[PDB]
Design a protein around this ligand. Structure first.
Ligand SMILES: Nc1ncnc2c1ncn2[C@@H]1O[C@H](COP(=O)(O)OP(=O)(O)OP(=O)(O)O)[C@@H](O)[C@H]1O
Ligand SMILES: Nc1ncnc2c1ncn2[C@@H]1O[C@H](COP(=O)(O)OP(=O)(O)O)[C@@H](O)[C@H]1O
Lengths: 187, 354, 71, 472, 506, 50
């Protein structure tokens, strides 16, 4: 009975990983080691990224894995073994995606209910803070669990704001309201 | 200003896959440009594969596209110059003239995937369009803003018939003509242009009375599946703006159905029965229901039909014949008796002979 | 490109452990999917093509498709 | 210990249930879901692995949410059985819709059982005299066998079945189980009123029939199982009581078409013309449980609908090998007014051997099929030139053939309102002697129209006398 | 003036009131839109066939649900629904406004009126996917639907709750039968009794805009629009609208059915609905069947036409009667589509092209057109004076190909041939002139009993209007007798025979 | 009566292009700024209410 389904699109590798490590506790370590291997891919961009190509080999993928773990002895335990499977399964290319998805599952376990406050222009901090509080002081979050919150800039909207999280949203902005005004007055 | 620039990731024949950077994507049926050394290469977005990645059909030749070229967006659909300056100017489906008479100094640029007119504006009593030829206006009268199936192969005076319609609509109702060859043979395209000069309906110095849109055969199928829409939009601007009764000539609507077949078979959609595309009724309706009569004016269409293998249960004539108000047959056995025109009387029947 | 056939949640889990049950499954296997008189089955690495097998309930089968992952 | 799952996928009539208890419910078991409309029953078709079953839906699944609780019932879809179910209209699950209360019966057997063994098979040459001319002359129906009515769209499949009800089921003595598979709801209601008035259904008393319906309104999970419900009620009386069981099934083609509306969704590759690939086995399980053992007889009459008269359609062509007495109905016969439009050519039976029905009967049937085959061969020259360009034996052959065609008509006791003629139940021996008389040439000068829509040869003489007194 | 702005500002208060409670436990991003259908991530609490609304006004129905994403079909052109937009879920299974306030209006498939006569005075919402009424609250049909045509009520009668099919070919006079029936119901829609009124719901699918415009203009010339409901799904609009619109109109019909009143519906024409359904099932990779209609296309017309029968007294004795129209290909009755509508409806009116080519309009082929539960619900008078007429036209059809030889014959075939030609020329009818049963009885009565045999064949068309005006001026009491009683007794029959032989004598 | 309905349609289309004029009037304002406060207090009203 794991939380936040991946279901279908290649997050199942992560799902297996999660449930295999869920019974052996060590998830934060796993999560941290995933952060560390994602960062050491990012901090070596020529052929840390561009050596995630399907045309290499069985063996060269395995040795990149060995080259990857050569930088740090005892890479957690489970995430060093999972790479071998992926190296053999050649699904290495779709890998940092798995990192992001395991991150989503992990911070779901923490309960960080990532939200968003879409606008067409970034806003002051007081609005940010007051909304974050409200969102924290809400039914939505049952407390005991966090609440990130990201303002984004959207030109496709004409301004206003929309709050988003838990596939549950409120849009009191301008664009939609112009739309509704028009529709009712276009009869 | 704020361009939406992405990279071509895949060229498959006439299908082109364009990746866009995030939160920028235009919707379906929007014009995209690619600058070439030879000119511009237009794409029309038809399917969104997700992943900020769209899939388009070509509108000109797709040789030599390095994947990774910049993809410029124009937001709206395929723009066409409209109005008075378009008369006597051979415009392709892009919007550029190909007669080498310089650029067309038109005043507006219109989209082609517009809405058809709403139900409150459809004219509720189809009167009779006085064409001018006797046998037309006697036996099988053309519906004002209706649809007319002109059968028969070439060489029976069909171009003479259609120029006669041009002159008589120019005289009696004062309306202009928009001819559109979807899939038109290029050689007889030029022969039609020369003959329309010499008959006086195209004056290169005065005021010509027709706009030509020739979607040639050597264009990829995404072109021919929009050439009729280009001619349709040039009809719609003369209808709803200046208020006339405009004749939209389309040859040949079966090649438009072929264009539909090959576009929606290149996209990987499953083909229907006989092998025409499964969007047959809808992508005939989006051409038919924009040819109608509003309270401002009207566009009446004369469109030919190539009956496939001399058979009338094949769904392309069996779909066109659910729309045609009046047929007109230019048979062989009437011009063989030396009769001009060769409107055969027993066959050309109208739904408005009532 | 596309989901492969040896990627179910109940099979990768065991491979993550390092138990490597697939090497141990020469005489025995496990049922993966069984409908319409067909049983995609994981295991039996030593199995042949056109070899008879018995399921543990009592109904018998012929092994036809030997794919990389499953039988 | 209830076994709970979640709906994780809905596509129309196919619903996916994920489980987390490792004991997954087996194949052909019944799940159920508490809906705001009541309940809804699912049937487990295939395991996808990953602790996930993929099930067919016995009723309409508008409005399920992903993650709704799915409850187990352990076994297959149970159906009430016994004498309690008589005169009742049982739905596919087993909820009666005659609204006369629940069916207080003892046992509820599951539908999916195996067919009987090969040693349990029984044979019988018991000829069933039905009283129809075209049946009892050219293709005698067999008691204990099976009887097929292959018929096109609206040429009298359902009317012929009600004819066999009105001519058999009263004088049968066993029981009858009618099963409306995908037919019209209104025709089900009219058969219900005919069962009430003619005393087959006795509401307060004891009845002899059991209605198992479920119509073309139902989504395709029901139509792929409703014939199994009627089958289980049939073979219960075949095994529990040791009776004779009439099993009228209309229509068996809707079963296989419900086999074709789920199989494209269950991930089976599309087979030939559009049907499922699991066809011969599913039609096999539905046919081979309608059989005749040493405990009782099942003499079933099954309609077969044919899509647009194309008898190369895979479902009725598969059905042909399972039936002991076919009967082909064709629209090109029915347009000429010959009712019923039994194709005299393609009708067969396992019966009609000289040592089974008598040598005279066999010889008469052979002569009639020879004359009609001669007509169907000479059809084209008649169509082109006319009847005048024949020989003088063959012109007499064509004329006697067109006598015998219009003589094959018979005014039905159920189609009385179409023709205005009361019903005609002509026994076998008079029909044998009648066809022997017309074959021997005793009546060759009678006008053809007097043969039309008649009973026996006595009524042919009488009706020719009527038209003689009228035309004069 | 500003009165619609007042009303729209009240609606702004509703929109602003809805914005105060707008928390959409649903929204998800549009992953990919392709093949004219959208895939949506999120919406973890949606229902099967739940209505959703994209951020451009195009509504949608969510017809399949998968672990991971939900597949929503569109309700318009896909030009509006863009990738990466916002998908609120409405909350409803697909419903339409039903109730009496739609009478006069012209809506499309989702209850949006497009006439330009303000919003729909809607007496409620009802599902599109309603389970058909089971076999117990049904009664076999016993009331006439007087179509007003001569040949229809002569030969192939229609009961309230009897699903009859009008099958035919292209431009062969298919729509005119349904239009004349709707115009015939003016006899009772002006009246006062509810149980004799008969509301007409005409459901144009796949047709042109201007055809539906002319048909609304026709139903306002002859004043049918106090009882008409037009559901238009014109061929400009995209395919799931055409897949939906006859079902929503069947919900409109069921509203009149459950509430005691009687109502006629006309589907026109379902051979374009199956076109729209094979478009929606050949864009979702579902594999085709025979002639590329997908394998469940029998089930579609099933679940459509089975929501129409006669309810018994237990539910309120309401009804719904359907006339689907099927466009075949060249006189065919054995393609895959017209052998599924025939295997549902209770009979056919096969409008053969060859007879309309000879101008005999309407061109009912008598020997093919039959009805199954028509005969138990005809008007009693016609059933008394046309019990020979079906058999007599069968008799005349027997000698149809026998008289083409040109051979000299006996007296009886010449008598039947003359009477059959007089009856064939007799059943013609002009457009928009349905004849009530009170006038259908004497014309058929003059046809049956040999009175026409002295008249030449060309005078029969004016004989119709002459004999009708002869009965309207003089024997008006006989027409009132046929109106009230609906049955010819012996004295009525003798008076009618006198009134015939009078005008027959000159 | 027909002409009255036509005049009502003309009044409505004039106020439709006047709605376009009102869109042009609204979109130049620092209501683009001031209205973010309206959303702020509105989200305070909505999310506190549960
Ligand atoms: N009784 C009649 N009097 C005069 N004209 C008639 C009559 N019946 C049919 N018609 C003619 O039939 C033509 C087509 O009518 P109708 O629309 O019923 O045919 P259709 O096959 O239904 O066409 P569609 O299928 O496109 O609707 C009309 O032009 C009409 O003039
Ligand atoms: N004995 C008969 N006399 C005249 N017509 C008949 C007879 N039997 C059947 N029919 C015709 O057959 C039709 C019934 O066919 P049926 O099998 O009920 O249709 P379906 O194919 O839908 O089951 C009726 O319309 C009727 O006209």
């Amino acid at each position: 009975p794991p939380p936040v389904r991946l279901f279908g699109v290649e997050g199942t590798y992560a799902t297996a990983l999660y449930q295999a490590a869920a019974k052996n506790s060590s998830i934060d370590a796993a999560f941290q080691s995933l952060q560390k291997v994602e960062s050491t891919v990012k901090k070596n961009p020529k052929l840390g990224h561009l050596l995630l190509n399907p045309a290499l080999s069985l063996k060269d993928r395995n040795s990149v894995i060995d080259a990857i773990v050569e930088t740090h002895k005892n890479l957690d335990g489970y995430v060093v073994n999972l790479l071998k499977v992926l190296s053999e399964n050649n699904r290495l290319g779709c890998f940092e995606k798995i990192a992001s998805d395991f991150g989503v599952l992990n911070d779901a376990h923490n309960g960080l209910l990532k939200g968003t406050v879409t606008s067409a222009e970034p806003l002051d901090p007081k609005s940010f803070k007051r909304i974050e509080k409200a969102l924290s002081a809400s039914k939505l979050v049952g407390q005991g669990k966090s609440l990130k919150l990201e303002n984004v800039v959207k030109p496709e909207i004409k301004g206003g704001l929309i709050v988003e999280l838990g596939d549950k949203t409120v849009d009191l902005s301008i664009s939609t309201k112009i739309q509704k005004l028009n529709k009712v007055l276009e009869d | 200003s704020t361009p939406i620039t992405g990279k071509v990731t895949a060229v498959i024949g006439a299908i082109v896959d364009v990746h866009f950077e995030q939160s920028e994507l235009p919707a379906i049926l929007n014009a995209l440009e690619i600058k070439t050394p030879q000119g511009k290469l237009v794409l029309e977005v038809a399917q969104h594969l997700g992943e900020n990645t769209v899939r388009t059909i070509a509108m000109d030749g797709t040789e030599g596209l390095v994947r990774g070229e910049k993809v410029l967006d124009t937001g709206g659909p395929i723009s066409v110059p409209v109005g008075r300056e378009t008369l006597g100017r051979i415009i392709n489906v892009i919007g550029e003239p190909i007669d080498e008479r310089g650029p067309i100094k038109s005043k507006l640029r219109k989209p082609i995937h517009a809405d058809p007119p709403s139900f409150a504006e459809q004219s509720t009593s189809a009167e009779i369009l006085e064409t001018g030829i006797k046998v037309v206006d006697l036996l099988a009268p053309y519906a004002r803003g209706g649809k007319i199936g002109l059968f028969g192969g070439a060489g029976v005076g069909k171009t003479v018939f259609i120029q006669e319609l041009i002159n008589n609509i120019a005289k009696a109702h004062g309306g202009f003509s928009v001819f559109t060859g979807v899939g038109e043979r290029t050689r007889e395209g030029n022969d039609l242009y020369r003959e329309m000069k010499e008959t006086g309906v195209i004056n290169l110095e005065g005021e010509s009375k027709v706009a030509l849109v020739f979607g040639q055969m050597n264009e990829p199928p995404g072109a021919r599946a929009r050439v009729a829409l280009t001619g349709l939009t040039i009809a719609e601007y003369f209808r709803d703006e200046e208020g006339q009764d405009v004749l939209l000539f389309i040859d040949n609507i079966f090649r438009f159905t072929q264009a539909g077949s090959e576009v929606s078979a290149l996209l990987g959609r499953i083909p229907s029965a006989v092998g025409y595309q499964p969007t047959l009724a809808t992508d005939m309706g989006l051409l038919q229901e924009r040819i109608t009569t509003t309270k401002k004016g009207s566009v009446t269409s004369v469109q030919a039909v190539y009956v496939p293998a001399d058979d009338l249960t094949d769904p392309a004539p069996a779909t066109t014949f659910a729309h045609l108000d009046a047929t007109t047959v230019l048979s062989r056995g009437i011009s063989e008796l030396g009769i001009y025109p060769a409107v055969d009387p027993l066959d050309s029947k109208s739904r408005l002979l009532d | 490109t596309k989901a492969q056939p040896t990627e179910v949640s109940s099979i990768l889990e065991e491979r993550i452990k390092g138990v490597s049950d697939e090497a141990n499954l020469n005489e025995t296997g496990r049922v993966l999917a069984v409908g319409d008189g067909i049983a995609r089955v994981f295991g039996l690495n030593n199995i042949q093509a056109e070899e008879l097998v018995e399921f543990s309930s009592g109904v018998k089968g012929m092994a036809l498709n030997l794919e990389p992952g499953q039988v | 210990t209830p076994i709970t799952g979640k709906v994780t996928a809905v596509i129309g009539a196919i619903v996916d249930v994920h489980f987390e208890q490792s004991e997954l419910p087996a194949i052909l078991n019944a799940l159920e879901i508490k809906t705001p409309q009541g309940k809804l029953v699912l049937e487990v078709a295939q395991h996808l692995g990953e602790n996930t079953v993929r099930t067919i839906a016995m009723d309409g699944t508008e409005g399920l949410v992903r993650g709704e609780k799915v409850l187990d019932t352990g076994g297959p879809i149970s159906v009430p059985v016994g004498r309690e179910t008589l005169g009742r209209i049982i739905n596919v699950i087993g909820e009666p819709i005659d609204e006369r209360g629940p069916i207080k019966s003892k046992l509820r057997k599951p539908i999916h059982a195996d067919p009987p063994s090969f040693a349990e098979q029984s044979t019988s040459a018991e000829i069933l005299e039905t009283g129809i001319k075209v049946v009892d002359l050219l293709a005698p129906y067999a008691r204990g066998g099976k009887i097929g009515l292959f018929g096109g769209a609206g040429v009298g499949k359902t009317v012929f079945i009600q004819e066999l009800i009105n001519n058999i089921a009263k004088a049968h003595g066993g029981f009858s189980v009618f099963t409306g598979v995908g037919e019209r709801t209104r025709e089900g209601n009219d058969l219900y009123r005919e069962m009430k008035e003619t005393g087959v259904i006795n509401l307060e008393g004891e009845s002899k029939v059991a209605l198992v319906f479920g119509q073309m309104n139902e989504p395709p999970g029901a139509r792929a199982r409703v014939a199994l419900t009627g089958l289980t009620i049939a073979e219960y009386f075949r095994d529990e009581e040791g009776q004779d069981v009439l099993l009228f099934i209309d229509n068996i083609f809707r079963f296989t078409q419900a086999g074709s509306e789920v199989s494209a969704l269950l991930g089976r590759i599309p087979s030939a013309v559009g049907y499922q690939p699991t066809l011969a086995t599913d039609m096999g399980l539905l046919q081979e449980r309608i059989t005749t053992t040493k405990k009782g007889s099942v003499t079933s009459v099954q309609a077969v609908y044919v899509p647009a008269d194309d008898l190369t359609d895979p479902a009725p062509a598969t059905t042909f090998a399972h039936l002991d007495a076919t009967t082909v109905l064709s629209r090109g016969i029915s347009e000429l007014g010959i009712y019923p439009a039994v194709d005299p050519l393609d009708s067969k039976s396992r019966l009609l051997d000289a040592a089974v029905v008598g040598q005279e009967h066999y010889d008469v049937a052979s002569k009639v099929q020879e004359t009609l085959q001669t007509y169907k061969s000479l059809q084209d020259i008649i169509a082109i030139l006319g009847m005048d360009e024949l020989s003088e034996q063959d012109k007499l052959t064509v004329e006697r053939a067109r006598k015998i065609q219009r003589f094959l008509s018979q005014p039905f006791a159920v189609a009385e309102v179409f023709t205005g003629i009361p019903g005609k139940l002509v026994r076998l021996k008079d029909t044998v002697a009648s066809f022997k008389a017309v074959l021997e040439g005793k009546y060759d000068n009678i006008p053809e129209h007097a043969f039309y829509m008649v009973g026996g040869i006595e009524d042919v003489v009488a009706k020719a006398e009527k038209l003689a007194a009228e035309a004069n | 003036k500003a009165q619609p702005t007042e009303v729209s500002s009240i609606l702004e208060e509703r929109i602003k009131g809805v914005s105060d409670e707008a928390n959409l436990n649903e929204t998800g991003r549009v992953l990919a839109v392709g093949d004219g259908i959208a895939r949506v991530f999120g919406l973890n609490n949606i229902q099967a066939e739940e209505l959703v609304e994209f951020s451009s006004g195009v509504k949608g129905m969510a017809l399949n649900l998968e672990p991971g994403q939900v597949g929503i079909v569109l309700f318009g052109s896909d030009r509006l629904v863009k990738e990466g937009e916002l998908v609120k879920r409405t909350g409803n299974i697909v419903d339409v406004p039903v109730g009496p306030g739609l009478l006069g209006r012209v809506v499309d498939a989702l209850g949006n009126p497009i006439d330009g006569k303000g919003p729909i005075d809607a007496a409620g919402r009802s599902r599109a996917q309603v389970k058909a009424p089971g076999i117990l609250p049904r009664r076999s049909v016993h009331e006439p639907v007087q179509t007003g045509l001569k040949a229809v009520d002569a030969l192939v009668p229609i009961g309230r709750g009897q699903r009859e099919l009008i099958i035919g070919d292209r431009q062969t006079g298919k729509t005119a039968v349904a239009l004349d029936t709707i115009l015939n119901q003016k006899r009772w829609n002006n009246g006062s009794d509810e149980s004799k009124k008969l509301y007409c719901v005409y459901v144009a699918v796949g047709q042109k805009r201007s055809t539906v415009a002319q048909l609304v203009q026709t139903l306002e010339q002859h004043d049918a629009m106090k009882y008409s409901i037009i559901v238009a799904a014109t061929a400009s609009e995209a395919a799931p609208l055409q897949y939906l619109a006859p079902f929503t109109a069947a919900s409109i019909g069921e509203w009149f059915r459950d509430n005691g009143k009687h109502a006629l519906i006309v589907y026109d024409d379902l051979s374009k609905q199956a076109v729209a359904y094979r478009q929606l099932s050949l864009l979702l990779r579902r594999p085709p069947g025979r002639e590329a209609y997908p394998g469940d296309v029998f089930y579609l017309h099933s679940r459509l036409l089975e929501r129409a029968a006669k309810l018994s007294e237990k539910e309120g004795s309401g009804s719904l009667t359907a006339l689907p129209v099927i466009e075949t290909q060249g006189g065919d009755v054995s393609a895959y589509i017209p052998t599924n509508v025939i295997s549902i409806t209770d009979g056919q009116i096969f409008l053969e092209a060859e007879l309309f080519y000879k101008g005999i309009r309407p061109a009912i082929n008598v020997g093919l057109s039959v009805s199954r539960v028509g005969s138990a619900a005809q008007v009693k008078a016609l059933k008394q004076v046309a019990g020979s007429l079906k058999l007599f036209l069968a008799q005349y059809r027997e000698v149809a190909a026998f008289a083409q030889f040109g051979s000299d014959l006996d007296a009886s075939t010449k008598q039947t041939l003359v009477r059959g030609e007089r009856l064939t020329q007799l059943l013609k009818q002009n457009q928009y002139s349905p004849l009530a049963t009170e006038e259908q009885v004497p014309l058929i009565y003059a046809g049956v009993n040999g009175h026409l045999d002295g008249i030449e064949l060309s005078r029969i068309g004016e004989f119709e209007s002459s004999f009708l005006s002869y009965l309207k001026s003089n024997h008006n009491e006989l027409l009132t007798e046929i109106r009230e009683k609906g049955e010819l007794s012996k004295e009525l029959l003798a008076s009618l025979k006198s009134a015939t032989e009078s005008f027959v004598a000159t | 009566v027909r002409y009255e309905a036509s005049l009502r349609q003309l009044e409505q289309r004039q106020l439709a292009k006047s709605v376009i004029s009102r869109v042009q009037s609204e979109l130049g304002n620092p209501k683009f700024q001031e209205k973010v406060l309206q959303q702020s207090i509105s989200e305070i009203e909505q999310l506190l209410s549960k």
